[PDB]
Amino acid sequence: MAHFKEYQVIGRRLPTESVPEPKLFRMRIFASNEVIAKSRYWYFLQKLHKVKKASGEIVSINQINEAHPTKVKNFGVWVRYDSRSGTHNMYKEIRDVSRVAAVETLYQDMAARHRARFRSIHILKVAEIEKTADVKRQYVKQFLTKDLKFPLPHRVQKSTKTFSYKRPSTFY
């Protein structure tokens, strides 16, 4: 694969004689490829209404992009998953001016602040919030203070050549 892309997959099973023009459903899948996109749409639909790639078809495999990626996206996550034992539930607030990567910080946050593989992960509600108070996590409300700025010490300079002859400082 690679990095995520939100796909607008809309399936309606496989229309038969008695089931012409089925009800139809739009489930949102993530991943970089479309084959891995439809694979996820069918397992998830393999968890709702009785089917498999054998009894139904995903009408289309569309894409999804942000209409205003110049504003800071203060997202509020919601996810379901398993564990090296059973299964649990969770909620976060990952910020980023891009949906798919806020979800990558998640698939990484699952393997980092919990050590859990992508497989063991079903992402659900991902809705940016408006009002500052609506924001729960204060370590996300950490960058909401009015009139803000901030510096960064110990600039560990990248060495392209082996031996240096200055023995550098933290200047930054």
Binding site: H154, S159, T162, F163, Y165, K166, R167, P168
Partner: protein, 197 residues
């Protein structure tokens, strides 16, 4: 870049510096290390200490005579962080290592000549702020090496000498800098100023 290169020790993290050295060694660049005692390490001294104790009990029982040799000297300890990090059994390796000369303090030859500072070792580069580090000093002090102050004082010497040599060199190239100012304004200067150098 230079035939038999030099290496300043203070700051460097034992391991990182050990491999860049073993590389240039089995490559053909004769290199010598200096001040293996100001050679910073990691975590707390007690840890590494107890770890050295491991090499201290490791020896042949039927004859401690022909057993692993646990060199106490801060330099001899680093020579082991290369010994097992290169083929010192092969004709190539034995002599490959020969380009190597590890030294304590900054002896006379290497104090008049420039000493190199490698970023991939220097603590202020391969370590996290607040995360405790160690020093070859305190370890050797309590492991078998008994020349701590011996060198410690030879630096109060070697250092005090090359120290006032810079105060000279400082104001030397201080008025040589006022000569660079009154060397411009001319075309030979205006020209080279736009021609790169």
């Amino acid at each position: 870049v230079e035939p038999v290169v030099v290496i300043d020790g203070k700051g460097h993290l034992v391991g990182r510096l050990a491999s860049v050295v073993a590389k240039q060694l089995l490559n053909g660049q004769k290199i010598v290390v200096v001040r293996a005692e100001e050679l910073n390490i990691s975590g707390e001294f007690f840890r590494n200490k107890l770890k050295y104790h491991d090499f201290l009990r490791k020896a042949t029982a039927f004859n401690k005579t022909r057993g692993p040799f646990h060199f106490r000297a801060p330099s001899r300890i680093f020579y082991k962080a290369l010994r097992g990090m290169v083929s010192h059994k092969t004709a190539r390796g034995k002599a490959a290592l020969e380009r190597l000369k590890v030294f304590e303090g900054i002896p006379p030859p290497y104090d008049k000549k420039k000493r190199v500072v490698v970023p991939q070792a220097l603590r202020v580069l391969r370590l996290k702020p607040g995360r405790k580090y160690t020093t070859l000093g305190k370890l050797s002090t309590s492991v078998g090496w008994k020349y701590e102050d011996v060198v410690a004082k030879l630096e109060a010497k070697r250092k005090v000498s090359s120290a006032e040599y810079y105060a000279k060199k400082r104001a030397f190239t201080k008025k040589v800098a006022s000569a660079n100012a009154t060397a411009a304004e001319s075309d030979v200067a205006k020209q080279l100023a736009a021609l790169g150098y």
